[PDB]
Amino acid sequence: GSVVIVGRIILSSITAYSQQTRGLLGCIITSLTGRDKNQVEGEVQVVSTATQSFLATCVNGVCWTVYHGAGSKTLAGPKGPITQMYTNVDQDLVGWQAPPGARSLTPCTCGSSDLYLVTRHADVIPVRRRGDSRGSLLSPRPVSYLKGSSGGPLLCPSGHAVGIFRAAVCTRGVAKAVDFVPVESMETTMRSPVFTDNSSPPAVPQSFQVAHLHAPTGSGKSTKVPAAYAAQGYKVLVLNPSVAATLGFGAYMSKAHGIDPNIRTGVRTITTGAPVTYSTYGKFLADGGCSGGAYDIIICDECHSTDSTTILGIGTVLDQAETAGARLVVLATATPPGSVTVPHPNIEEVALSNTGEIPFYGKAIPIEAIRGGRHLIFCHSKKKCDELAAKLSGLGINAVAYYRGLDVSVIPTIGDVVVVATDALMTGYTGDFDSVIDCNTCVTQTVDFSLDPTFTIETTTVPQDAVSRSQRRGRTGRGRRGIYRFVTPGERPSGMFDSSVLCECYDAGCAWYELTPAETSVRLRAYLNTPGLPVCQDHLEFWESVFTGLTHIDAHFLSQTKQAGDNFPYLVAYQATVCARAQAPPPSWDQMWKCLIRLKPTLHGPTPLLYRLGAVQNEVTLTHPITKYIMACMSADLEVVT
Amino acid sequence: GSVVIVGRIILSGSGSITAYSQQTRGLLGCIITSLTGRDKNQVEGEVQVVSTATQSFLATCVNGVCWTVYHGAGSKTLAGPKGPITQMYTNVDQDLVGWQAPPGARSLTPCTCGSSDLYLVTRHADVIPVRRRGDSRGSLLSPRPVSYLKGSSGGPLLCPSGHAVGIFRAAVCTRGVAKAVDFVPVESMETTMRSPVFTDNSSPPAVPQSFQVAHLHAPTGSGKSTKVPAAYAAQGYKVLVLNPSVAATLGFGAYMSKAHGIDPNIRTGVRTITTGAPVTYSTYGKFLADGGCSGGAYDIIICDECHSTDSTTILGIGTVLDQAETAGARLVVLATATPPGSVTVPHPNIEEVALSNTGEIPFYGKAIPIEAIRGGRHLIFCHSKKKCDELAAKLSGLGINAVAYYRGLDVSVIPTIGDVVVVATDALMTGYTGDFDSVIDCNTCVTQTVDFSLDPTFTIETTTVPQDAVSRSQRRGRTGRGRRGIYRFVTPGERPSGMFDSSVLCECYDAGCAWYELTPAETSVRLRAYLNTPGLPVCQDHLEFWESVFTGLTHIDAHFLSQTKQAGDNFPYLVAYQATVCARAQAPPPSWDQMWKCLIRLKPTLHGPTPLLYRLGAVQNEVTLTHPITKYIMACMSADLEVVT
Ligand SMILES: CC[C@@H]([NH2+][C@@H](C)CC(N)=O)c1ccc(Cl)c(Oc2ccccc2)c1F
Ligand SMILES: CC[C@@H]([NH2+][C@@H](C)CC(N)=O)c1ccc(Cl)c(Oc2ccccc2)c1F
């Protein structure tokens, strides 16, 4: 679907009124066709997807808005879908060529400290500028007042644009400031190229540089290129988030380029003294990061990956590389932030229908589609993998489930099989398949600053973004004609990750890699500050402050929850420690808290709740000191998407 | 818009109960079908996944009737093969609606055997085990987050043999987790089918020999409050007519003296007369201030505008219903032009014209031409005080005699008389009784709703929502009275009539404490009589909860209460109470909104964090949760609480 214009705020002292020009039916058809024949007027446009509605402000002949709402989408236009002219994911900014009849605001030259934010409801909210991207609302307003107004103009008194609104800065649920994209970030974006070629490795520079490599898996981004570099006489470290891919490079380089390299995973380590090393991000962090002098080039493969280990690992490289004597970091991926899924020559795509013997996410799979051969069916949860493997086995199709927890030996590597897997597949198994069938959804975590009492980590089923869809489809069609069947044809924008991933990085830091919160921050600071990487909201101060107060955890609990492989082993363990000290029962008796099961006779009363990590069945008390500290931490300034 | 079928849930054939979903329509197909009311796609399966524009849920055919919940479907028609099917049963009291099952749609069959191990099917095709605790209740064997169940209302509850016990309609929560489920019994679906499909209420009832509560569903024009009470009086009966509006009450009495003959008793705060006549007109507020029914006085009590869900009206009707048989009345009539489940039908005096973007005056995203409002007397309904004053401002500058009206301002600021454009909120409707040449409607309104947000307690949020069938009808009803009328509107939509929020239950206890010296226990009795009387607007039963909250709010400062009372704002007790607690800790209020003006004078002696009891708006000050009243309220949030899904 395309972004659709559904109305306009007309600007006129500054005042405004809004005008609606479409309803739901129209918005839906227009988004599907990409064809909008309505006459565009005004400088601010009310726009909408099938999900969110928001704004777009025309400046200098470009119509601008936020990446978090528009993604990389085309805008419906008179001739047809308009492709985006600019896409600056780093600045939460995208932009289309202004259609005829649109007026443009001209940039604010002088720069008043006094500024007015136009909202989607046609209000003109005064704002005092505090910095380049920061203004304080004269009247603190609830956060929900500003919702739907991402992409709206901030104006000086004369009516020239100072920037477009991108996020509220909340203090305990009330908006006291605003983050906007400066007009000078737009003029900078208009002066960068629309075509920077990243498909070739850079040549090694005289001094330190970070460089980007965009090219598909198989192209030898991970094999040929490190070899080429080794030939020129350099030492190269290749980081990867999969144990199975890292190990498989070992026997691959030996066969193919006569280099018997160093391999470093948690399960296995080989030192051959080769000039090339392949390691997981995880083993890299276990070994303390960059060793003084050991490497010239550090290639971070699958840098589109937004799990906590990769992020923490990449930001370690970026914080340490130059001081360890690196001259080159290369961030490598086939799917950088802002990518969309384009057709693939080797892959035929066929929507699923309702005609099929096997139900699947409201559609159907025909037995004939998966009876012969090797097939990969992605499902969102383990529960659903178990269900589908059971049905298929019961019809005599040779079927097998794989997800986090299982050994990859459930395999089966040669012969007929239907593999029903979660995304864990993409890290534990390196093989390709005759067809891929994709449910087009994933499970994700989201933090919610719910103040009940502190924060919550919700697990939610969500639509897949452009990176998931591409990575899943790319398990077929690798040098051999593949089919890709799907339940649904859309895809969310790529390259954004949630604040809970940040939280996960402190947790793993503390739990797994002996990092203080201060230390975790510095490495995340290096990641955030590097252009072209995935993006998130800057909630570092906040998570640092939270984990900073979580002291004298109980070793036994920590170990146990690490060994069960829970998410957030540190937060779970820490809550467990507080409970067992306070002589109080845990939030519930979910598996999550099994680590406390032998104290169940003696633990009684209300749970000293620190935060919410699932359903809380027990009564709660807010009197524990750690709770009060975490409550106090919620007064910090939180950027929120609006 | 119609309800559209967009998928189904196929139950298994044998062995253990299991199911899977089939999706038959996307969003685009769903909207088109809803707007045309036409659905040529055939219908298999007994459990349909159904949607509206705004939401989606389930329906379960049993005995040839496709049943769903009223809170989901309202009174809407079902998209069918030869166009929209109208509802056959609309049992608002039971949260139960029903269409005739379309061609070859298959139907579950009722729990013949009667077991107590149950299985709930959800929209995801999951199959939760449930233990029957009562006629209409069941506990989850493994409790669950209430969000798991969203979108499954309408879904069936099966016994092991595959037979339908009931349909899911609500989660019973404790602090965010669903311990239980409420469903509509299958035998409520048979009580429903075993009755007339059409019941009449168009005529005033005959006076029964013994106590009976009747409904009078009739236009404001049939003379619900003049003719019908005169007629009863003409036959020698003592009649009390209650009404929410002081203006309407005085008007009826004045009309009765000049028209139907006699000089009735009037009872309002601003005016009271005891003539000794046998008709008495009163407001619900004066009636409650007077302590309700005093025995022997009346044979018939007409509760006019019984569709109103302001707190006084509900608290009023609840009193009459608790007290009237024991006070010797023979008849309680519940009168309204717009009863629960009613739809806005067309009016022969009234031309209904969609606003467009063509026009000089912006109006909620559309536009009004000045042509349409210079020629005569017109009424513009706006949602806020703000928009009202803003739009007076614009119109008058354009050479129009416009005046704002809302709560606080004085009626008769409306010229009587002149040639006018009055810009008003719904306050118009209880403030002023005149009609107009045309009504212009924004089709939205401000309402309050409660959020059990546990942060630390609950939150009363004010929001703007689309108007319901009752709102549209009453607003439009201010033109086309006798003469010709024109109704112009921004949106054609209309939410289901007859449902009110738990926050309205909150205001009842609040008003009982602030205005009518009713302990919470006494308020619960009165509210209970209301919930239990059929054919009145419906709510979720949060009575124990709210009673328990207000029972803790003891020793309020009289002085603050009297100010929040006079200032006329919502929830004077909760506001006075929070301010009371704030003043006794020498702490500030949650913010300095106008809500808290009673504490401005103490500003310089108030310091530290606010001991927050509950959220009635933005909280700007830092908060402490250690006050004993906060803790007492936190304990109250462990009540069993019905919530919809
Ligand atoms: C413009 C700020 C930028 N964040 C900085 C910390 C830079 C960085 N390394 O991410 C940013 C860019 C793009 C988007 Cl969609 C942003 O907002 C969100 C919102 C929700 C999820 C993820 C990002 C954003 F916050
Ligand atoms: C079947 C329960 C019934 N409530 C009882 C207290 C009876 C009564 N007098 O209301 C009921 C009927 C209809 C509906 Cl839409 C119900 O659910 C809601 C949901 C949200 C708002 C209002 C009512 C309901 F809860």
Are the beta carbons of A565 and A594 closer than 8 angstroms?
Answer: no
Tell me the DSSP string of B385-411. Answer: HHHHHHHHHHHHHTT--EEEE-BTB-T
Tell me chain A's radius of gyration from C-alpha atoms: 26
Q: Alpha-carbon distance B426 to B442, whole Å?
A: 11
Instruction: Kindly state if the Cβ of A164 falls inside 6 Å of ligand 1.
Output: no
Instruction: Kindly state if the Cβ of B644 falls inside 6 Å of ligand 2.
Output: yes
Q: Alpha-carbon distance B344 to A348, whole Å?
A: 52
Q: Alpha-carbon distance B642 to B619, whole Å?
A: 27
Strand A44-48 relative to strand A53-59: parallel, antiparallel, unpaired? antiparallel
**Which run of H or E residues covers position A506?**
helix A499-512
Q: Distance of CA A268 to CAs A243, A283, A406, A412, Å?
A: 9, 10, 18, 22
- B609 and chain A in contact, CB less than 8 A: no
Burial A481-492 (b: 16+ CB within 10 A, else e): ebbbbbbbeebb
Are the beta carbons of A466 and A491 closer than 8 angstroms?
Answer: yes
Are the beta carbons of B81 and B39 closer than 8 angstroms?
Answer: yes
**Amino acid at residue number B33:** T
Please give the backbone phi and psi of residue B322, each rounded to the nearest 5 degrees, phi first. Answer: -75, -30
Is A219 known to sit in a ligand binding site? Answer: yes
Q: Alpha-carbon distance A47 to A64, whole Å?
A: 11
Q: Taking CA A523 as the corner, what is the angle to CA A132 and CA A308, rounded to the nearest 5 degrees?
A: 105
Q: Alpha-carbon distance A151 to A165, whole Å?
A: 5
User: Which residue precedes each gap in chain A (C to N above 2.5 Å)?
Assistant: 12
Is A216 known to sit in a ligand binding site? Answer: yes
Q: Which of A354, A451, A615 sits opposite B24 (nearest CB)?
A: A354
Least Cα distance to B219 among B307, B351, B315, B97 occurs for B307
Is B54 known to sit in a ligand binding site? Answer: no
Q: Into which CATH architecture does domain A191-339 fall?
A: 3-Layer(aba) Sandwich (3.40)
B95 included as an active-site residue = yes
Tell me the DSSP string of B234-277. Answer: HTT--EEEEES-HHHHHHHHHHHHHSSS---EEE-SS-EE----
Please give the backbone phi and psi of residue B13, each rounded to the nearest 5 degrees, phi first. Answer: -90, -40
Of all residues in chain A, what percent are helix, strand and coil, respectively (each to 5)? 30, 30, 45
Instruction: Kindly state if the Cβ of A92 falls inside 6 Å of ligand 1.
Output: yes
Are the beta carbons of B593 and B546 closer than 8 angstroms?
Answer: no
B96 half-sphere exposure, CB direction, 13 A CA radius: 24
Residue B543's contacts (CB-CB under 8 Å, 6 or more residues apart) are: B505, B524, B527, B528, B531
**Which run of H or E residues covers position B72?**
helix B70-73
Other CB atoms within 10 A of residue B261 CB: 12
Ligand lying nearest the CA atom of residue B91: 2
**Amino acid at residue number B140:** L
Of all residues in chain B, what percent are helix, strand and coil, respectively (each to 5)? 25, 30, 45
Q: Alpha-carbon distance B431 to B247, whole Å?
A: 6
The SS3 assignment for B342 reads coil
Tell me the DSSP string of B581-616. Answer: HHHHTT---S--SGGGGGGGGGGGG--S-EE-S-BS
Are the beta carbons of A203 and A175 closer than 8 angstroms?
Answer: no
Ligand 2: centre distance to CA B52 (Å): 20
**Which run of H or E residues covers position A179?**
strand A174-182
Least Cα distance to A365 among A470, A483, A466 occurs for A483
Q: How was this structure determined?
A: X-ray
Please give the backbone phi and psi of residue B499, each rounded to the nearest 5 degrees, phi first. Answer: -115, 135
Q: Alpha-carbon distance A437 to A385, whole Å?
A: 13
The SS3 assignment for B321 reads helix
Are the beta carbons of A55 and A42 closer than 8 angstroms?
Answer: no
User: Which residue precedes each gap in chain B (C to N above 2.5 Å)?
Assistant: none
Both tokens of B507, joined, read 């205001």
Q: Into which CATH architecture does domain A498-631 fall?
A: Orthogonal Bundle (1.10)
Least Cα distance to A135 among A109, A168, A108 occurs for A168
B599-608, Cβ contacts within 8 angstroms, sequence gap of 24 or more: B606/B582
Q: What top-level class would CATH report for the domain B110-193+638-645?
A: mainly beta
**Amino acid at residue number A226:** P
B389 half-sphere exposure, CB direction, 13 A CA radius: 6
Residue A464's contacts (CB-CB under 8 Å, 6 or more residues apart) are: A438, A440, A441, A442, A472, A491, A492
Least Cα distance to A110 among A167, A183, A57, A187 occurs for A183
Other CB atoms within 10 A of residue B368 CB: 24
Tell me the DSSP string of B451-520. Answer: E---SSS-EEEEEEEEPBHHHHHHHHTTB-SSS-EEEEES----BPSSB--HHHHHHHHHHHHHTS---H
Which residue from B minimizes the CA distance to A6?
A: B365
Strand spans (E) along B341-387: 350-354, 361-363, 366-368, 378-381
Residue B529, phi-psi category: left (phi > 0), alpha (psi -120 to 50), beta (remainder): alpha
Residue B335's contacts (CB-CB under 8 Å, 6 or more residues apart) are: B215, B216, B218, B224, B225, B228, B302, B303, B304, B305, B306
What number does CATH give the domain B194-342? Answer: 3.40.50.300
Q: Alpha-carbon distance A594 to A587, whole Å?
A: 11
Tell me the DSSP string of B526-563. Answer: HHHHHHHSTTS-B----HHHHHHHHHH--S--HHHHHH
Sole residue written with tokens 């909630």: A539
Beta bridge partners of B479: B436
- A158 and chain B in contact, CB less than 8 A: no
Are the beta carbons of B62 and B22 closer than 8 angstroms?
Answer: no
Return the axis-axis angle of helices B628-636 and B543-552, rounded to nearest 10°. Answer: 170
CATH level 3 topology of B501-634? RNA Helicase; Chain A, domain 3 (1.10.820)
Sole residue written with tokens 């699947």: A360
Is B199 known to sit in a ligand binding site? Answer: no
Are the beta carbons of B598 and B574 closer than 8 angstroms?
Answer: no
CATH number of this structure's domain A107-190+635-642, picked from the four choices 2.40.10.10, 3.40.50.1260, 3.40.1410.10, 3.30.930.10:
2.40.10.10
Q: A-contacting residues of B 430-489, CB under 8 Å?
A: 453-456
Instruction: Kindly state if the Cβ of A537 falls inside 6 Å of ligand 1.
Output: yes
CATH number of this structure's domain B343-500, picked from the four choices 1.10.3210.10, 3.30.1380.10, 1.10.10.60, 3.40.50.300:
3.40.50.300
Q: Distance of CA A496 to CAs A302, A447, B230, B591, Å?
A: 15, 14, 71, 35
Handedness of CA B609, B613, B614, B615 (dihedral sign): negative
Handedness of CA B14, B15, B18, B20 (dihedral sign): negative
Tell me which chain A residues have a C-beta less than 8 angstroms from the C-beta of B625: 453, 622
Residue B252's contacts (CB-CB under 8 Å, 6 or more residues apart) are: B225, B226, B241, B243, B281
CATH level 3 topology of A1-105? Thrombin, subunit H (2.40.10)
CATH level 3 topology of B1-108? Thrombin, subunit H (2.40.10)
Q: Distance of CA A588 to CAs A562, B18, B175, Å?
A: 19, 28, 13
Is A354 close to B31, i.e. CB distance below 8 A?
Answer: no
Which residue from A minimizes the CA distance to B639?
A: A619
Q: Alpha-carbon distance B5 to B255, whole Å?
A: 52
Residues of A designated catalytic: 68, 92, 150
Q: Give Cα A360 distance to the centre of its chain.
A: 26
Other CB atoms within 10 A of residue A132 CB: 10
Strand order in the sheet with A62-65: A16-20, A4-11, A44-48, A53-59, A62-65, A93-97, A86-88
Q: Is the peptide bond before A453 cis (omega within 30 degrees of 0)?
A: yes
Other CB atoms within 10 A of residue A333 CB: 26
DSSP A381: S
**Amino acid at residue number A66:** V
Least Cα distance to B289 among B559, B515, B611, B21 occurs for B515
Is B177 close to A617, i.e. CB distance below 8 A?
Answer: yes
Other CB atoms within 10 A of residue A383 CB: 11
Measured in angstroms, the resolution is 2.5
The SS3 assignment for A373 reads coil
Q: Taking CA A303 as the corner, what is the angle to CA A445 and CA A286, rounded to the nearest 5 degrees?
A: 80
Q: Taking CA B326 as the corner, what is the angle to CA B516 and CA B337, rounded to the nearest 5 degrees?
A: 70
Q: Alpha-carbon distance A625 to A578, whole Å?
A: 10
Q: Alpha-carbon distance A120 to A118, whole Å?
A: 7
Sole residue written with tokens 């528009």: A70
Are the beta carbons of A239 and A258 closer than 8 angstroms?
Answer: no
Name the residue of B71, B189, B314 whose CB sits within 8 Å of the most ligand 2 atoms, as the mutation to test its pocket.
B71
Instruction: Kindly state if the Cβ of A501 falls inside 6 Å of ligand 1.
Output: no
Are the beta carbons of B339 and B219 closer than 8 angstroms?
Answer: no
Q: Distance of CA B406 to CAs B284, B425, B431, B467, B473, Å?
A: 20, 6, 8, 18, 19
DSSP B205: P
Least Cα distance to A66 among A175, A168, A192 occurs for A168
- Work out the end-to-end distance of chain B between its first and last CA atoms, rounded to an integer number of angstroms: 21
Q: Alpha-carbon distance B21 to B122, whole Å?
A: 10
Q: Alpha-carbon distance A48 to A55, whole Å?
A: 8
Are the beta carbons of B338 and B497 closer than 8 angstroms?
Answer: yes
Are the beta carbons of B209 and B330 closer than 8 angstroms?
Answer: yes
Q: Taking CA B119 as the corner, what is the angle to CA B115 and CA B124, rounded to the nearest 5 degrees?
A: 165
DSSP B217: E
Least Cα distance to B530 among B340, B348, B368, B258 occurs for B340
Are the beta carbons of B60 and B107 closer than 8 angstroms?
Answer: no
Handedness of CA A470, A475, A479, A482 (dihedral sign): negative
Least Cα distance to B460 among B557, B584, B546 occurs for B546
User: Please, what's the largest Cα pairwise distance for chain B?
Assistant: 78
Least Cα distance to B364 among A22, A121, A27, A53 occurs for A121
Residues in chain B: 645
Residue B164's contacts (CB-CB under 8 Å, 6 or more residues apart) are: B60, B62, B108, B109, B110, B111, B156, B157, B158, B186
Are the beta carbons of A38 and A48 closer than 8 angstroms?
Answer: no
Q: Alpha-carbon distance B105 to B44, whole Å?
A: 6
**Which run of H or E residues covers position A264?**
strand A262-264
Q: Alpha-carbon distance B91 to B605, whole Å?
A: 57
B390-398, Cβ contacts within 8 angstroms, sequence gap of 24 or more: B391/B361, B391/B363, B391/B423, B392/B423, B394/B361, B395/B361, B395/B421, B395/B423, B398/B360, B398/B361, B398/B370
Are the beta carbons of B171 and B146 closer than 8 angstroms?
Answer: yes
Burial A434-444 (b: 16+ CB within 10 A, else e): bbbbbbbbbeb
What number does CATH give the domain A340-497? Answer: 3.40.50.300
**Amino acid at residue number B600:** I
Least Cα distance to B296 among B267, B325, B316, B274 occurs for B325
Ligand lying nearest the CA atom of residue A318: 1
Least Cα distance to B265 among B286, B273, B257 occurs for B273
Are the beta carbons of A276 and A258 closer than 8 angstroms?
Answer: no
Q: Alpha-carbon distance A379 to A420, whole Å?
A: 7
Q: Alpha-carbon distance A365 to A387, whole Å?
A: 14
Q: Which of B53, B366, B456 sits opposite A20 (nearest CB)?
A: B366
Both tokens of B385, joined, read 């005080």
Beta bridge partners of B38: B80
Q: Distance of CA B48 to CAs A52, B14, B28, Å?
A: 28, 20, 18
The domain segmentation of chain B, as residue ranges, is: 1-108, 110-193+638-645, 194-342, 343-500, 501-634
- The yes-or-no answer to whether A191-339 and A340-497 have a common fold is yes
Q: Alpha-carbon distance B508 to B288, whole Å?
A: 12
Q: Alpha-carbon distance B110 to B193, whole Å?
A: 14
Tell me the DSSP string of A478-489. Answer: SSS-EEEEES--
- A138 and chain B in contact, CB less than 8 A: no
The SS3 assignment for A181 reads strand
Ligand lying nearest the CA atom of residue A185: 1
Residues in chain A: 642
Both tokens of A488, joined, read 């649904």
Are the beta carbons of A490 and A463 closer than 8 angstroms?
Answer: yes
Q: Alpha-carbon distance B321 to B283, whole Å?
A: 16
Other CB atoms within 10 A of residue A397 CB: 18
B270 half-sphere exposure, CB direction, 13 A CA radius: 6
Q: Alpha-carbon distance B219 to B565, whole Å?
A: 34
* Exposed / middle / buried, residue B205 (Cβ in 10 Å: 0-12, 13-18, 19+): middle
- Catalytic residue selected from B71, B307, B383, B542: B71
